[PDB]
Amino acid sequence: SQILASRGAELFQATIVKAVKARIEEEKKSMDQLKRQMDRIKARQQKYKKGKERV
């Protein structure tokens, strides 16, 4: 157990960095999805404005 001190630190750090990688992946995906939703809303509003076109 004296020789194997660093192995536990390596394992814990690997778990932490894997969790952080999954977190940033999920965050990026959610941000892109929300941004696409916002663009669709903008496009629908612009289409309505152009359909109005016959402060």
Number of Cβ within a 10 Å radius of residue 29? 10
Helices (H), the chain: 5-52
Resolution to one decimal, Å: 3.8
Give the span between the Cα atoms of 8 and 2, in whole angstroms. 11
Question: Experimental method used, please?
Answer: cryo-EM
Cα torsion angle, 43, 46, 48, 50, sign:
negative
User: Phi/psi of residue 2, each to 5°?
Assistant: -70, -40
CA distance 19 to 55: 49
Q: Please give the single-letter amino acid code of residue 8.
A: G
**Could you give the dihedral angle defined by the CA atoms of residues 14, 16, 19 and 24, in that order, rounded to the nearest 10 degrees?**
-100
